[PDB]
Amino acid sequence: IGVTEEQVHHIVKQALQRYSEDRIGLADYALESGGASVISTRCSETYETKTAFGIPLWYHSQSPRVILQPDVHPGNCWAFQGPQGFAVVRLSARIRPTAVTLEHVPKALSPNSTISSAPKDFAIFGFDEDLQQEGTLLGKFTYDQDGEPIQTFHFQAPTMATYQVVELRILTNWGHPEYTCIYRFRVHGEPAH
Amino acid sequence: IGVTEEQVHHIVKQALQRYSEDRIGLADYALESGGASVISTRCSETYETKTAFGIPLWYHSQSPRVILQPDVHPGNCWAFQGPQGFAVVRLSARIRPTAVTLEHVPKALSPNSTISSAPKDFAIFGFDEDLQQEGTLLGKFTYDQDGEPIQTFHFQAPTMATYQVVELRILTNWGHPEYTCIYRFRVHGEPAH
Amino acid sequence: IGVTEEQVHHIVKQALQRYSEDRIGLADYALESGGASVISTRCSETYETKTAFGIPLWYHSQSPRVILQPDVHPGNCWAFQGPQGFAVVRLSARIRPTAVTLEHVPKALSPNSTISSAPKDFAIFGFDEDLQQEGTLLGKFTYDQDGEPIQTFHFQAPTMATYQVVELRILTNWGHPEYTCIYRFRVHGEPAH
């Protein structure tokens, strides 16, 4: 069949253009750089007593705001106790949610190739309210510890109801004892206009 | 004609090497990481009262320094009032300016594919002075809202006069009512040696 | 022989997957995001009196912690006096060190294509101690100012002794008068399990 050396370059330029549109090419309404985390969020656990060794004077602790942050190097996730937890996000716009993305650090950059602190089963809720009127289940999915670090999850047959407040509820993790860790959560959709 | 699978890899390695040299492969003398923004700069507008809702305690406001910062995610630009504004930059070296680069967030990551807060017409001035002796017009161009997010603009027939202080003057925007937004401005050239 | 347009895409997706696993695909136990710099480290030099011009109020000075930070834009390295210096790092885990990586800014982004502040000859030491019991030489190498910005250096025939504290000792630089500059140092290995 056969590809030409210039078709090759156009394939590369195209792939790098996409790679550089936040990788997946979809607007993120949960990106803190636009708008952000409430804190009807789970407690928050430090994934380490290398601390005991111990509080470096410049050191702090990942707030849940970290999940709305694109920085995803091995340090940078938000951890909560056990395999169940939640974060509530106030989006930068009122949108009709069509998808979400979750990512975790690559297996390659992890001790022993284990991402056992990775979220597994999770769900998304719409809170029609700028408040806590018990949320509407938007969808339920499973973060796959194989498959790629970045996974996008599209709502099966969503209404065109709009929300500006959603919940990330995690239900199971990939088996880690103490804690689960969230690197970055994103929300995609169609703006109320 | 035909490409081999190994010629393909060399094309990719080469493209990724370039992609990783700040994408365009040219030194940026306006990169704050080397040297920085004065503030014979326009006022500065907050692109939002999602604030009214309202001052998150960790929250701040984009200084004009943001245009000298490589971080270009949807949040991260500097906004000023209306379609006209300016920023004055003190470069990390005395150089002979041969080009500038401007970028804006990809259409793909923007609400409705609109980058209407994007700069349109703009100009560059040399201030021979570490002061305000009325600037020398270096060049005039137009940021294209199609065409790619990163655009480089080479001076038509520049002198080899050297400057360490330049002005970014924006003249028109792509039609946004309240404000224009600058993601990143860069200055390329030949060092006085 | 001949490549197909879809084999081309799989080559690109694969290359971008690797590019995005911190480029080299190996865990970094010296990444501050996991665990960090002691300060049986060399003094620390400011690579500039553009300062005299002078202390911008937001301005600070690169701590040696910067070498454990993935941010490698032209500003972001750690400088010490003359061509000889050292930094001591406490890894995020006790590992058996099999390699190290050093990087410097691309020639392309440097004034005149000179990376003369680049480290040249260097060595790595294991301190079996969470203390200063004179270190065990792990290996000796040379950062090549051609060859690529990111260079990885594998230990010739390492024992399976484990350490959580290593020293980066630099011996020669690429010829710069005042100072040498370190962008990022990484430590790879097999965890004590």
PDB file of all heavy atoms in Angstrom, chain C residues 66-98, unseen atoms left out:
ATOM      1  N   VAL C  66      15.607  21.771  43.294  1.00  0.00           N
ATOM      2  CA  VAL C  66      15.224  21.954  41.914  1.00  0.00           C
ATOM      3  C   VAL C  66      15.686  20.772  41.074  1.00  0.00           C
ATOM      4  O   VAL C  66      15.013  20.389  40.112  1.00  0.00           O
ATOM      5  CB  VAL C  66      15.846  23.314  41.434  1.00  0.00           C
ATOM      6  CG1 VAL C  66      16.171  23.309  40.047  1.00  0.00           C
ATOM      7  CG2 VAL C  66      14.899  24.421  41.765  1.00  0.00           C
ATOM      8  N   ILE C  67      16.844  20.200  41.390  1.00  0.00           N
ATOM      9  CA  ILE C  67      17.300  18.991  40.675  1.00  0.00           C
ATOM     10  C   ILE C  67      16.401  17.799  40.812  1.00  0.00           C
ATOM     11  O   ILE C  67      16.565  16.858  40.073  1.00  0.00           O
ATOM     12  CB  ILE C  67      18.679  18.548  40.994  1.00  0.00           C
ATOM     13  CG1 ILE C  67      18.754  17.778  42.275  1.00  0.00           C
ATOM     14  CG2 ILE C  67      19.613  19.729  41.148  1.00  0.00           C
ATOM     15  CD1 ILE C  67      20.270  17.386  42.756  1.00  0.00           C
ATOM     16  N   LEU C  68      15.488  17.800  41.798  1.00  0.00           N
ATOM     17  CA  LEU C  68      14.508  16.689  41.990  1.00  0.00           C
ATOM     18  C   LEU C  68      13.192  17.092  41.419  1.00  0.00           C
ATOM     19  O   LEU C  68      12.164  16.491  41.684  1.00  0.00           O
ATOM     20  CB  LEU C  68      14.379  16.323  43.489  1.00  0.00           C
ATOM     21  CG  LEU C  68      15.731  16.018  44.107  1.00  0.00           C
ATOM     22  CD1 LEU C  68      15.548  15.761  45.623  1.00  0.00           C
ATOM     23  CD2 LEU C  68      16.498  14.843  43.402  1.00  0.00           C
ATOM     24  N   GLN C  69      13.210  18.153  40.653  1.00  0.00           N
ATOM     25  CA  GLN C  69      11.996  18.667  40.044  1.00  0.00           C
ATOM     26  C   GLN C  69      12.046  18.558  38.559  1.00  0.00           C
ATOM     27  O   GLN C  69      13.024  19.014  37.957  1.00  0.00           O
ATOM     28  CB  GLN C  69      11.697  20.111  40.539  1.00  0.00           C
ATOM     29  CG  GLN C  69      11.081  20.162  41.940  1.00  0.00           C
ATOM     30  CD  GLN C  69      11.202  21.499  42.595  1.00  0.00           C
ATOM     31  OE1 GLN C  69      11.570  22.468  41.944  1.00  0.00           O
ATOM     32  NE2 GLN C  69      10.911  21.571  43.862  1.00  0.00           N
ATOM     33  N   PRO C  70      10.977  18.017  37.954  1.00  0.00           N
ATOM     34  CA  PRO C  70      10.837  17.677  36.540  1.00  0.00           C
ATOM     35  C   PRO C  70      10.792  18.962  35.623  1.00  0.00           C
ATOM     36  O   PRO C  70      11.002  18.879  34.413  1.00  0.00           O
ATOM     37  CB  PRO C  70       9.477  16.884  36.522  1.00  0.00           C
ATOM     38  CG  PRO C  70       8.709  17.554  37.576  1.00  0.00           C
ATOM     39  CD  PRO C  70       9.694  17.745  38.660  1.00  0.00           C
ATOM     40  N   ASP C  71      10.568  20.128  36.234  1.00  0.00           N
ATOM     41  CA  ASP C  71      10.451  21.367  35.476  1.00  0.00           C
ATOM     42  C   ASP C  71      11.845  21.781  34.979  1.00  0.00           C
ATOM     43  O   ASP C  71      12.733  22.134  35.774  1.00  0.00           O
ATOM     44  CB  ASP C  71       9.842  22.469  36.375  1.00  0.00           C
ATOM     45  CG  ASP C  71       9.414  21.971  37.847  1.00  0.00           C
ATOM     46  OD1 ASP C  71       8.572  21.038  38.056  1.00  0.00           O
ATOM     47  OD2 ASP C  71       9.855  22.623  38.847  1.00  0.00           O
ATOM     48  N   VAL C  72      12.079  21.746  33.678  1.00  0.00           N
ATOM     49  CA  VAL C  72      13.452  21.873  33.120  1.00  0.00           C
ATOM     50  C   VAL C  72      13.562  23.023  32.024  1.00  0.00           C
ATOM     51  O   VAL C  72      14.400  22.991  31.143  1.00  0.00           O
ATOM     52  CB  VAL C  72      13.833  20.452  32.644  1.00  0.00           C
ATOM     53  CG1 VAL C  72      14.229  20.354  31.239  1.00  0.00           C
ATOM     54  CG2 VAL C  72      14.761  19.761  33.641  1.00  0.00           C
ATOM     55  N   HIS C  73      12.687  24.015  32.089  1.00  0.00           N
ATOM     56  CA  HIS C  73      12.796  25.152  31.236  1.00  0.00           C
ATOM     57  C   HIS C  73      14.011  25.931  31.535  1.00  0.00           C
ATOM     58  O   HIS C  73      14.439  25.883  32.648  1.00  0.00           O
ATOM     59  CB  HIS C  73      11.599  26.089  31.386  1.00  0.00           C
ATOM     60  CG  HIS C  73      10.435  25.607  30.613  1.00  0.00           C
ATOM     61  ND1 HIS C  73       9.449  24.808  31.173  1.00  0.00           N
ATOM     62  CD2 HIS C  73      10.125  25.764  29.313  1.00  0.00           C
ATOM     63  CE1 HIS C  73       8.588  24.480  30.222  1.00  0.00           C
ATOM     64  NE2 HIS C  73       8.974  25.065  29.090  1.00  0.00           N
ATOM     65  N   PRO C  74      14.576  26.631  30.537  1.00  0.00           N
ATOM     66  CA  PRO C  74      15.798  27.406  30.759  1.00  0.00           C
ATOM     67  C   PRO C  74      15.942  28.064  32.095  1.00  0.00           C
ATOM     68  O   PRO C  74      17.003  27.938  32.762  1.00  0.00           O
ATOM     69  CB  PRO C  74      15.882  28.338  29.539  1.00  0.00           C
ATOM     70  CG  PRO C  74      15.295  27.471  28.477  1.00  0.00           C
ATOM     71  CD  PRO C  74      14.239  26.593  29.115  1.00  0.00           C
ATOM     72  N   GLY C  75      14.974  28.674  32.643  1.00  0.00           N
ATOM     73  CA  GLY C  75      15.410  29.074  34.021  1.00  0.00           C
ATOM     74  C   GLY C  75      15.968  28.015  35.034  1.00  0.00           C
ATOM     75  O   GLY C  75      16.958  28.246  35.635  1.00  0.00           O
ATOM     76  N   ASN C  76      15.249  26.892  35.189  1.00  0.00           N
ATOM     77  CA  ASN C  76      15.157  25.977  36.301  1.00  0.00           C
ATOM     78  C   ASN C  76      16.255  24.946  36.628  1.00  0.00           C
ATOM     79  O   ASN C  76      16.055  23.770  36.569  1.00  0.00           O
ATOM     80  CB  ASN C  76      13.772  25.260  36.072  1.00  0.00           C
ATOM     81  CG  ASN C  76      12.582  26.276  36.077  1.00  0.00           C
ATOM     82  OD1 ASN C  76      11.658  26.203  35.217  1.00  0.00           O
ATOM     83  ND2 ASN C  76      12.619  27.256  37.040  1.00  0.00           N
ATOM     84  N   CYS C  77      17.428  25.417  36.971  1.00  0.00           N
ATOM     85  CA  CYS C  77      18.464  24.513  37.461  1.00  0.00           C
ATOM     86  C   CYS C  77      19.019  25.021  38.762  1.00  0.00           C
ATOM     87  O   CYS C  77      18.719  26.169  39.227  1.00  0.00           O
ATOM     88  CB  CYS C  77      19.613  24.417  36.462  1.00  0.00           C
ATOM     89  SG  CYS C  77      20.056  26.129  35.870  1.00  0.00           S
ATOM     90  N   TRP C  78      19.852  24.173  39.342  1.00  0.00           N
ATOM     91  CA  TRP C  78      20.582  24.531  40.517  1.00  0.00           C
ATOM     92  C   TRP C  78      22.059  24.747  40.253  1.00  0.00           C
ATOM     93  O   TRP C  78      22.749  23.872  39.667  1.00  0.00           O
ATOM     94  CB  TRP C  78      20.319  23.482  41.615  1.00  0.00           C
ATOM     95  CG  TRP C  78      21.201  23.764  42.847  1.00  0.00           C
ATOM     96  CD1 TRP C  78      21.075  24.829  43.731  1.00  0.00           C
ATOM     97  CD2 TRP C  78      22.251  22.947  43.336  1.00  0.00           C
ATOM     98  NE1 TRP C  78      21.981  24.686  44.699  1.00  0.00           N
ATOM     99  CE2 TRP C  78      22.728  23.551  44.487  1.00  0.00           C
ATOM    100  CE3 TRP C  78      22.797  21.697  42.933  1.00  0.00           C
ATOM    101  CZ2 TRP C  78      23.790  23.024  45.212  1.00  0.00           C
ATOM    102  CZ3 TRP C  78      23.795  21.166  43.644  1.00  0.00           C
ATOM    103  CH2 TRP C  78      24.291  21.822  44.791  1.00  0.00           C
ATOM    104  N   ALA C  79      22.548  25.946  40.606  1.00  0.00           N
ATOM    105  CA  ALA C  79      23.986  26.289  40.320  1.00  0.00           C
ATOM    106  C   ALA C  79      24.852  26.326  41.560  1.00  0.00           C
ATOM    107  O   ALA C  79      24.422  26.734  42.678  1.00  0.00           O
ATOM    108  CB  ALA C  79      24.143  27.610  39.525  1.00  0.00           C
ATOM    109  N   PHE C  80      26.070  25.844  41.399  1.00  0.00           N
ATOM    110  CA  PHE C  80      27.026  25.992  42.453  1.00  0.00           C
ATOM    111  C   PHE C  80      28.293  26.574  41.790  1.00  0.00           C
ATOM    112  O   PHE C  80      28.546  26.426  40.569  1.00  0.00           O
ATOM    113  CB  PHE C  80      27.327  24.624  43.136  1.00  0.00           C
ATOM    114  CG  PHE C  80      27.783  23.560  42.182  1.00  0.00           C
ATOM    115  CD1 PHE C  80      29.067  23.616  41.580  1.00  0.00           C
ATOM    116  CD2 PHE C  80      26.968  22.465  41.876  1.00  0.00           C
ATOM    117  CE1 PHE C  80      29.503  22.608  40.732  1.00  0.00           C
ATOM    118  CE2 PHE C  80      27.418  21.455  40.975  1.00  0.00           C
ATOM    119  CZ  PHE C  80      28.661  21.526  40.395  1.00  0.00           C
ATOM    120  N   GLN C  81      29.104  27.198  42.640  1.00  0.00           N
ATOM    121  CA  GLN C  81      30.435  27.735  42.346  1.00  0.00           C
ATOM    122  C   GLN C  81      31.381  26.800  41.580  1.00  0.00           C
ATOM    123  O   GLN C  81      31.488  25.712  41.927  1.00  0.00           O
ATOM    124  CB  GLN C  81      31.051  28.114  43.700  1.00  0.00           C
ATOM    125  CG  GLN C  81      29.975  28.277  44.891  1.00  0.00           C
ATOM    126  CD  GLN C  81      29.277  26.928  45.364  1.00  0.00           C
ATOM    127  OE1 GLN C  81      29.900  25.813  45.349  1.00  0.00           O
ATOM    128  NE2 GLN C  81      27.980  27.026  45.720  1.00  0.00           N
ATOM    129  N   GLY C  82      32.063  27.266  40.524  1.00  0.00           N
ATOM    130  CA  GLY C  82      33.178  26.550  39.860  1.00  0.00           C
ATOM    131  C   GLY C  82      32.752  25.242  39.262  1.00  0.00           C
ATOM    132  O   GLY C  82      31.584  24.953  39.267  1.00  0.00           O
ATOM    133  N   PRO C  83      33.702  24.417  38.781  1.00  0.00           N
ATOM    134  CA  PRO C  83      33.357  23.174  38.108  1.00  0.00           C
ATOM    135  C   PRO C  83      33.177  21.938  39.028  1.00  0.00           C
ATOM    136  O   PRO C  83      32.881  20.821  38.528  1.00  0.00           O
ATOM    137  CB  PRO C  83      34.512  23.010  37.142  1.00  0.00           C
ATOM    138  CG  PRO C  83      35.717  23.378  38.023  1.00  0.00           C
ATOM    139  CD  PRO C  83      35.178  24.611  38.823  1.00  0.00           C
ATOM    140  N   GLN C  84      33.201  22.138  40.343  1.00  0.00           N
ATOM    141  CA  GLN C  84      33.062  20.998  41.290  1.00  0.00           C
ATOM    142  C   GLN C  84      32.077  21.221  42.404  1.00  0.00           C
ATOM    143  O   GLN C  84      32.131  22.231  43.099  1.00  0.00           O
ATOM    144  CB  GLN C  84      34.397  20.611  41.901  1.00  0.00           C
ATOM    145  N   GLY C  85      31.214  20.245  42.633  1.00  0.00           N
ATOM    146  CA  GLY C  85      30.152  20.407  43.587  1.00  0.00           C
ATOM    147  C   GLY C  85      29.388  19.145  43.839  1.00  0.00           C
ATOM    148  O   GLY C  85      29.670  18.099  43.254  1.00  0.00           O
ATOM    149  N   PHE C  86      28.418  19.216  44.749  1.00  0.00           N
ATOM    150  CA  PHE C  86      27.772  17.993  45.163  1.00  0.00           C
ATOM    151  C   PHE C  86      26.405  18.258  45.743  1.00  0.00           C
ATOM    152  O   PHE C  86      26.143  19.277  46.351  1.00  0.00           O
ATOM    153  CB  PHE C  86      28.641  17.198  46.160  1.00  0.00           C
ATOM    154  CG  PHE C  86      29.081  18.016  47.333  1.00  0.00           C
ATOM    155  CD1 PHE C  86      28.305  18.110  48.461  1.00  0.00           C
ATOM    156  CD2 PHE C  86      30.313  18.712  47.309  1.00  0.00           C
ATOM    157  CE1 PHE C  86      28.729  18.912  49.570  1.00  0.00           C
ATOM    158  CE2 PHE C  86      30.709  19.536  48.376  1.00  0.00           C
ATOM    159  CZ  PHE C  86      29.922  19.603  49.501  1.00  0.00           C
ATOM    160  N   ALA C  87      25.568  17.249  45.640  1.00  0.00           N
ATOM    161  CA  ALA C  87      24.239  17.270  46.231  1.00  0.00           C
ATOM    162  C   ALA C  87      24.019  15.850  46.794  1.00  0.00           C
ATOM    163  O   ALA C  87      24.409  14.879  46.161  1.00  0.00           O
ATOM    164  CB  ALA C  87      23.156  17.617  45.080  1.00  0.00           C
ATOM    165  N   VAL C  88      23.394  15.746  47.949  1.00  0.00           N
ATOM    166  CA  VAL C  88      23.067  14.489  48.578  1.00  0.00           C
ATOM    167  C   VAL C  88      21.564  14.385  48.671  1.00  0.00           C
ATOM    168  O   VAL C  88      20.897  15.309  49.155  1.00  0.00           O
ATOM    169  CB  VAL C  88      23.701  14.336  49.976  1.00  0.00           C
ATOM    170  CG1 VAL C  88      23.245  13.027  50.636  1.00  0.00           C
ATOM    171  CG2 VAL C  88      25.174  14.390  49.835  1.00  0.00           C
ATOM    172  N   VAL C  89      21.064  13.239  48.181  1.00  0.00           N
ATOM    173  CA  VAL C  89      19.627  12.980  48.014  1.00  0.00           C
ATOM    174  C   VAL C  89      19.228  11.767  48.835  1.00  0.00           C
ATOM    175  O   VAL C  89      19.907  10.786  48.829  1.00  0.00           O
ATOM    176  CB  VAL C  89      19.260  12.710  46.520  1.00  0.00           C
ATOM    177  CG1 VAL C  89      17.781  12.386  46.384  1.00  0.00           C
ATOM    178  CG2 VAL C  89      19.636  13.948  45.705  1.00  0.00           C
ATOM    179  N   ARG C  90      18.114  11.882  49.534  1.00  0.00           N
ATOM    180  CA  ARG C  90      17.488  10.849  50.273  1.00  0.00           C
ATOM    181  C   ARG C  90      16.290  10.345  49.463  1.00  0.00           C
ATOM    182  O   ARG C  90      15.300  11.044  49.364  1.00  0.00           O
ATOM    183  CB  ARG C  90      17.018  11.343  51.661  1.00  0.00           C
ATOM    184  CG  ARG C  90      16.386  10.090  52.446  1.00  0.00           C
ATOM    185  CD  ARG C  90      15.444  10.452  53.637  1.00  0.00           C
ATOM    186  NE  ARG C  90      15.720   9.556  54.782  1.00  0.00           N
ATOM    187  CZ  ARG C  90      14.922   8.543  55.176  1.00  0.00           C
ATOM    188  NH1 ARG C  90      13.740   8.265  54.590  1.00  0.00           N
ATOM    189  NH2 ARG C  90      15.295   7.801  56.204  1.00  0.00           N
ATOM    190  N   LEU C  91      16.408   9.150  48.878  1.00  0.00           N
ATOM    191  CA  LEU C  91      15.408   8.609  47.906  1.00  0.00           C
ATOM    192  C   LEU C  91      14.079   8.319  48.555  1.00  0.00           C
ATOM    193  O   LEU C  91      14.010   8.205  49.783  1.00  0.00           O
ATOM    194  CB  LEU C  91      15.893   7.300  47.235  1.00  0.00           C
ATOM    195  CG  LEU C  91      17.319   7.337  46.712  1.00  0.00           C
ATOM    196  CD1 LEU C  91      17.728   5.957  46.190  1.00  0.00           C
ATOM    197  CD2 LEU C  91      17.496   8.477  45.605  1.00  0.00           C
ATOM    198  N   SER C  92      13.042   8.186  47.741  1.00  0.00           N
ATOM    199  CA  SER C  92      11.736   7.990  48.259  1.00  0.00           C
ATOM    200  C   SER C  92      11.611   6.502  48.744  1.00  0.00           C
ATOM    201  O   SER C  92      10.771   6.165  49.600  1.00  0.00           O
ATOM    202  CB  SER C  92      10.755   8.263  47.150  1.00  0.00           C
ATOM    203  OG  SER C  92      10.675   7.226  46.158  1.00  0.00           O
ATOM    204  N   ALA C  93      12.407   5.602  48.184  1.00  0.00           N
ATOM    205  CA  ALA C  93      12.491   4.262  48.734  1.00  0.00           C
ATOM    206  C   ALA C  93      13.939   3.765  48.845  1.00  0.00           C
ATOM    207  O   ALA C  93      14.885   4.283  48.223  1.00  0.00           O
ATOM    208  CB  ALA C  93      11.665   3.277  47.912  1.00  0.00           C
ATOM    209  N   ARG C  94      14.091   2.682  49.609  1.00  0.00           N
ATOM    210  CA  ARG C  94      15.323   1.941  49.697  1.00  0.00           C
ATOM    211  C   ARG C  94      15.290   1.101  48.501  1.00  0.00           C
ATOM    212  O   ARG C  94      14.362   0.292  48.282  1.00  0.00           O
ATOM    213  CB  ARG C  94      15.358   1.104  50.987  1.00  0.00           C
ATOM    214  CG  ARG C  94      16.734   0.713  51.373  1.00  0.00           C
ATOM    215  CD  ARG C  94      16.970   0.108  52.791  1.00  0.00           C
ATOM    216  NE  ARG C  94      18.444  -0.005  52.834  1.00  0.00           N
ATOM    217  CZ  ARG C  94      19.261   0.906  53.349  1.00  0.00           C
ATOM    218  NH1 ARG C  94      18.772   1.965  53.973  1.00  0.00           N
ATOM    219  NH2 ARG C  94      20.575   0.759  53.226  1.00  0.00           N
ATOM    220  N   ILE C  95      16.292   1.288  47.664  1.00  0.00           N
ATOM    221  CA  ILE C  95      16.343   0.575  46.408  1.00  0.00           C
ATOM    222  C   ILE C  95      17.725   0.054  46.195  1.00  0.00           C
ATOM    223  O   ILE C  95      18.709   0.463  46.821  1.00  0.00           O
ATOM    224  CB  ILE C  95      15.956   1.492  45.099  1.00  0.00           C
ATOM    225  CG1 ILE C  95      17.100   2.489  44.757  1.00  0.00           C
ATOM    226  CG2 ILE C  95      14.609   2.205  45.287  1.00  0.00           C
ATOM    227  CD1 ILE C  95      17.026   3.253  43.456  1.00  0.00           C
ATOM    228  N   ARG C  96      17.797  -0.825  45.214  1.00  0.00           N
ATOM    229  CA  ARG C  96      19.062  -1.211  44.619  1.00  0.00           C
ATOM    230  C   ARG C  96      19.247  -0.379  43.321  1.00  0.00           C
ATOM    231  O   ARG C  96      18.595  -0.651  42.329  1.00  0.00           O
ATOM    232  CB  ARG C  96      18.948  -2.706  44.278  1.00  0.00           C
ATOM    233  CG  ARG C  96      20.187  -3.185  43.728  1.00  0.00           C
ATOM    234  CD  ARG C  96      19.872  -4.096  42.691  1.00  0.00           C
ATOM    235  NE  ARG C  96      21.090  -4.505  42.020  1.00  0.00           N
ATOM    236  CZ  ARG C  96      21.095  -5.173  40.872  1.00  0.00           C
ATOM    237  NH1 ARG C  96      19.956  -5.457  40.271  1.00  0.00           N
ATOM    238  NH2 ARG C  96      22.243  -5.528  40.320  1.00  0.00           N
ATOM    239  N   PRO C  97      20.181   0.580  43.317  1.00  0.00           N
ATOM    240  CA  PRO C  97      20.403   1.475  42.211  1.00  0.00           C
ATOM    241  C   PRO C  97      21.043   0.773  41.066  1.00  0.00           C
ATOM    242  O   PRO C  97      22.163   0.243  41.172  1.00  0.00           O
ATOM    243  CB  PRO C  97      21.388   2.500  42.765  1.00  0.00           C
ATOM    244  CG  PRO C  97      21.383   2.371  44.205  1.00  0.00           C
ATOM    245  CD  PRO C  97      21.065   0.925  44.454  1.00  0.00           C
ATOM    246  N   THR C  98      20.373   0.885  39.947  1.00  0.00           N
ATOM    247  CA  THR C  98      20.837   0.317  38.712  1.00  0.00           C
ATOM    248  C   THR C  98      21.248   1.402  37.662  1.00  0.00           C
ATOM    249  O   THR C  98      21.950   1.074  36.734  1.00  0.00           O
ATOM    250  CB  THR C  98      19.709  -0.529  38.084  1.00  0.00           C
ATOM    251  OG1 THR C  98      18.573   0.333  37.868  1.00  0.00           O
ATOM    252  CG2 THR C  98      19.271  -1.724  38.987  1.00  0.00           C
TER     253      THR C  98
END
